[PDB]
Amino acid sequence: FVNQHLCGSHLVEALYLVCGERGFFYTPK
Amino acid sequence: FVNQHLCGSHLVEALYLVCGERGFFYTPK
Amino acid sequence: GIVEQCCASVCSLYQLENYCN
Amino acid sequence: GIVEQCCASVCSLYQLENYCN
């Protein structure tokens, strides 16, 4: 699922799945 | 959509919708 | 943290916006 | 940023993990 174009909710979803209980930051601009 | 229990992808989704182009940080632990 | 306030209990816009950049 | 590297172009695990806490 990660090695593709990922935009908006699709990108946030990938971060959530990959990062797990570490969480993440989403900084689009 | 925000004034309910929100867990896991549901919570990340709410942050994405509310925060818009500011983005957000998700720090569950 | 956010899990305690929005998953384990009822979330709010006031709390969610605290996590926006 | 992340949009340029993963939306406007093809994402990678190596880049996504850079955004994990």
Author numbering:
A (entry chain B), B (entry chain B): 1 to 29
C (entry chain A), D (entry chain A): 1 to 21
Sentences from the paper on this structure:
To show that the procedures described in this paper are also valid for macromolecular structures, we grew non-merohedrally twinned crystals of two benchmark protein structures: cubic insulin and glucose isomerase (Sevvana, 2006). The complications of data collection using these twinned protein crystals were similar to the small-molecule examples. Automatic cell determination failed, but both RLATT and CELL_NOW clearly identified two domains in the case of insulin and three domains for glucose isomerase, and their orientation matrices were used in SAINT in the same way as for the small molecules. TWINABS produced detwinned HKLF 4 data and several HKLF 5 data sets. Both substructures were solved using dual-space recycling methods in SHELXD. PDB2INS was used to convert the .pdb file to a SHELX.ins file. Both the insulin and glucose isomerase models were refined using SHELXL by alternating with model building in real space using Coot.
Bovine insulin (Sigma; catalogue No. I5500) was dissolved in 0.02 M Na2HPO4 and 0.01 M Na3EDTA to a final concentration of 30 mg ml−1. Cubic crystals grew in about 1 h, and most of the crystals were interpenetrant owing to the high concentration of protein (which was deliberate in order to encourage the growth of twinned crystals) [Fig. 11(a), right]. Cubic insulin crystallizes in space group I213, which belongs to the lower symmetry cubic Laue group. In our case, CELL_NOW indexed the two domains using alternative settings. The resulting detwinned data set extends to a maximum resolution of 1.55 Å. Using these data, SHELXD found the positions of three disulfide bridges. Density modification and autotracing modules in a beta version of SHELXE could trace two chains.
